Amino acid sequence: MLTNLVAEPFAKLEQDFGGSIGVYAMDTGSGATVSYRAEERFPLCSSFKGFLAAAVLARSQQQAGLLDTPIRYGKNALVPWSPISEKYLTTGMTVAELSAAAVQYSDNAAANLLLKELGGPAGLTAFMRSIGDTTFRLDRWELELNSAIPGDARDTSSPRAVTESLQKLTLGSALAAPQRQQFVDWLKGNTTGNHRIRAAVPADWAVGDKTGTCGVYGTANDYAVVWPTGRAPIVLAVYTRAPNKDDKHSEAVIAAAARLALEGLGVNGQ
Template identity: 45%
Template sequence: MRRAVLTVLLLLGLAACSGPERPAPRPSPSTAPADVTPSDVLRDLERRHDARLGLLAVDTGTGTVVAHRPDERFAHASAGKLLLAGAVLERRGTVGLDERVRVPDETVPHSPVTESRTGRTLTWAEVLDAALRLSDNTAANLLAQDAGGPDAVTEVLRAWGDDVTRVDRLEPDVNTAVPGDERDTSTPRVLAGHVRALVLGDRLAEPARERLVGWMRASTTGTALVRAGVPSGWAVADRSGGAAYGSRHDLAVVWPPHGAPLVLAVMTSRRGQDDEGRDALVAQAAGVAVDALMARR
């Protein structure tokens, strides 16, 4: 009996010394989205082109992300025409696109459609087509004015949850892109979010979204950009932009032959005014990002 009591006391003492039982460790949650950024390759592209490169690309099916300087500011230039179009389409839908608007008597530079229609009228559908497909600058100003001007466009963006993008001026002043000037700037991460919401999401009613995608797929200004960086035959809808100080951008949705679409925002800038090779930089960066995303499928 005494030996049994001693044994029990010994076991109780050992249990007390060992402290409370620790819960089994939980498995760490998976990181989502997964980052597969080929950083060395993208930094090498920056060195070779003597430029700053911003990129955010996401596979909407897997959530895999490629990111390089995704939160740095770049002048959005004509890529911002997508935001103007989204603001007008959200307000007007497709019902109001047959209404007509008068083209000013004087147009601004690079207005391939409106310069031949001064003093006459266009439908809002024609204005959107000119801005998105041909990057007509006077058409972009008409869109901004229909939305209420730059301040009102900014309010729309804030309502969309964007507290980063700035819309301060009209064309062609948005294209000065002076380094350090935050007017008319945004980031690749934020702009990629807008592309996804406008082209693939439910920010716009379906008829308006379909019209937007049609104009972006028919765009003629980005053939040397993301379209040149993906395999031939892949469908692309994009809105490009270009400004001073080596600014060249492309906001795009890419549909591979199989699987979910990819969303890309590629932006560049330089310290100097030289813009040589900037199209190639965007195309090459897009190709690197797409290859990295597709390799993870």
């Protein structure tokens, strides 16, 4: 009834990109949605790290002091693209600091350390099942989860399930109130997304996001909660892939798809 009330040229955008774009956007006030390839699977890439941090926050509700726990690690724990954890190799970091690094810098070593805390990819998947997400699956660790192989369901979800779970965690009741605001605050402090959904969002609106870039198969993504002033928040997810291993990802295409999603919802923006 309220899905795709206004058609938007997503097909032309993905054809110009040379791949596939998946979009799901939800106006949490009216329930209206924009949906394009929204139930297809796309690789999560580093976007799983947002849900990883939420799963850590959920575990901290039953294990008080978890966030403050100092974690030491060896050089063998470093993974290419660990921009924060490499600076604390000789000191260690807290669980909360690792979580913030995973969310805000996509830190790979931090992500693997936190996955170990949860019992691995199946532990994160179990958390997602516990909030009602039956689509999400994490199967591997960094960096193997970035292979983005066409047709491979490992380490994928759908734009719709990403958006639905993001809404539950940032705006609904999946986390207790203090943990919910901490998750929002980590997303708001993200540093990796300035050229993606944020580039479609006016500077005077609040926004938290989590990006991912697999590095192959034109595969990259971003999901976000956006608070336009004077109306209810919008939750959205934009995922891309492409058929050839050497196909380039495009941040501009992600920003453009986000613009179309906001336009389709009737949200006056840029």
